[PDB]
């Protein structure tokens, strides 16, 4: 418990991402498919990383595989919090669930890893309703699509983002 708080911008973004409201298709394209959270300059709040996000409307036009490009947004030598809206299909249902991803690469500095790890249990308690968590400590543990599928439903998952595994 490092005492790092969660900014109101992150809470507002998460609430918009969780519950889908009836809106025009123009507003549906503005929904966030993925988003990254980072520490502030003073390291006192968890804030939104500007420009590091994926919109639903971008999927299928500029983005082919939303998960592949989301991984590219993860810094190589820095820790980050991620919120991915995973669309997958099991053997008897088509699911759409939010995934909380803790990106703590080994190449990251020790100061970044300590603060992010010690404040992870505080931000996740504010983001109520998330049932999937992915802790990745290297690029090989997050770049593979089957790694996310195993965390979602194990071997029951037969498709991810509309593409078979």
């Amino acid at each position: 418990a490092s005492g790092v708080a969660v900014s109101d911008g992150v809470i507002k973004v998460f609430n918009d991402m969780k519950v889908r409201k009836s809106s025009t298709p123009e507003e549906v394209k503005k929904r966030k498919k993925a988003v990254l959270f980072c520490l502030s300059e003073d390291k006192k709040n968890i804030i939104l990383e500007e420009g590091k996000e994926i919109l639903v409307g971008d999927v299928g036009q500029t983005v082919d595989d939303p998960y592949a490009t989301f991984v590219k947004m993860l810094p190589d030598k820095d820790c980050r919090y991620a919120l991915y809206d995973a669309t997958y299909e099991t053997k008897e249902s088509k699911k759409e669930d939010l995934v909380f991803i803790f990106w703590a690469p080994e190449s990251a500095p020790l100061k970044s890893k300590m603060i992010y790890a010690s404040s992870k249990d505080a931000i996740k308690k504010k983001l109520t309703g998330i049932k999937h968590e992915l802790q990745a400590n290297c690029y090989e543990e997050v770049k593979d699509r089957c790694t996310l599928a195993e965390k979602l439903g194990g071997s029951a998952v037969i498709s991810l983002e509309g593409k078979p595994l």
């Binding site: 889908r20 008897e92 249902s93 759409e96 049932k131």
Partner: protein
């Protein structure tokens, strides 16, 4: 875009009208420390908290916990606002009239749903099979029902309820797996045993003949891999666990099996319609998904019914979610939009409107 919620005794099926499969299927439990967890969150904590079933036997007994499940359904599972979508609810057979009004009141006052509807689970299963007359053997998680239906109306005096379903079979499989040296006692290990039951268990056509076969060879033995990588072997327990459905004495119960319960409910109907019920026995629920259960039911009922009656057991391949799939198609019809109970109608007639609009 209407919402279809199937409030089962142990599992809640939810989704959107028009979809082939429910979007969310989660346990219908509320957990409190030995401060409130619903669904898979209650199971993730395992043993710290205590679990309660508010709809344990198809009939809602704790309405405070039932609202928590509904709130978890709309916001956490379906991820939609209940005030923007009409909701179609399902109810167990022999549901008291007080519960129907309580369901309507909660939907309109707590969640402010624009429209609302109640359907009987057994009738939706029968309609999904292309029938209006027949008997539905709905075996779920906490309760088993045999509901004879004539021209789309269930006969309440002939409905029989059996407190023997998949929940009791999961516990029985845990008990008999300890005879092989394994130990499944914790909440986490119970979910492992349930996965074993849904993957390796089957109903034997002849129980005594099958037991002799398993005791003379190893062709019936299957291997299962635990989440931690350990591999266990299960032999005759594959067909012994679902045998408790036909022999409840395996669980220490004095009640009759599902085959005799089906026969007894048919015998409680009019003599002129018993011939139609014999040839229109439809299976529904997750506990009827064991391979070989339709053939076993056909053999057992034939031995009970007169030899001149034609016994036909209907086991559609999608009978596990036939209640939800039938409700989703019904709620997605453009002609069904006039059958909803609007909020305007609720404000005039009160919760009693459900009796004349949904029967």
């Amino acid at each position: 875009a209407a919402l279809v919620v199937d409030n089962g005794s142990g599992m809640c099926k939810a989704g959107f009208a028009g979809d082939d499969a429910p979007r969310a299927v989660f346990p219908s439990i509320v957990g409190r420390p030995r401060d409130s967890y619903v669904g898979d969150e209650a199971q993730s904590k395992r043993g710290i908290l205590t679990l309660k079933y508010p709809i344990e036997h198809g009939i809602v007994t704790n309405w405070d916990d039932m609202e928590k499940i509904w709130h978890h359904t709309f916001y956490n599972e379906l991820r939609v606002a209940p005030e923007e979508h009409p909701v179609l609810l399902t109810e167990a057979p022999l549901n008291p009239k007080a519960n129907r009004e309580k369901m309507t009141q909660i939907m309109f006052e707590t969640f402010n749903t624009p429209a609302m509807y109640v359907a009987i689970q057994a009738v939706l299963s029968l309609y999904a099979s292309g029938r209006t007359t027949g008997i539905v053997m709905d075996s779920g998680d906490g309760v088993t029902h045999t509901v004879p239906i004539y021209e789309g109306y269930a006969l309440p005096h002939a409905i029989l309820r059996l407190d023997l379903a998949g929940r009791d079979l999961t516990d029985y499989l845990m008990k008999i797996l300890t005879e092989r040296g394994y130990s499944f006692t914790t909440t986490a290990e119970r979910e492992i045993v349930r996965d074993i039951k849904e993957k390796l268990c089957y109903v034997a056509l002849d129980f005594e003949q099958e037991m002799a076969t398993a005791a003379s060879s190893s062709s019936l033995e299957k291997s299962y891999e635990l989440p931690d990588g350990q591999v266990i072997t299960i032999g005759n327990e594959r067909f012994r666990c679902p045998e408790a459905l036909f022999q409840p004495s395996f669980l220490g119960m004095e009640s009759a099996g599902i085959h005799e319960t089906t026969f007894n409910s048919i015998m409680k109907c009019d003599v002129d319609i018993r011939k139609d019920l014999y040839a229109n026995t439809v299976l529904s629920g997750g506990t009827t998904m064991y391979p070989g259960i339709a053939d076993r039911m056909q053999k057992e009922i034939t031995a009970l019914a007169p030899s001149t009656m034609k016994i036909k057991i209907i086991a559609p391949p999608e009978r596990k979610y036939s209640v939800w799939i039938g409700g989703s198609i019904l709620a997605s019809l453009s002609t069904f939009q006039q059958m909803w109970i609007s909020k305007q109608e609720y404000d005039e007639s009160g919760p009693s409107i459900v009796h004349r609009k949904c029967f």
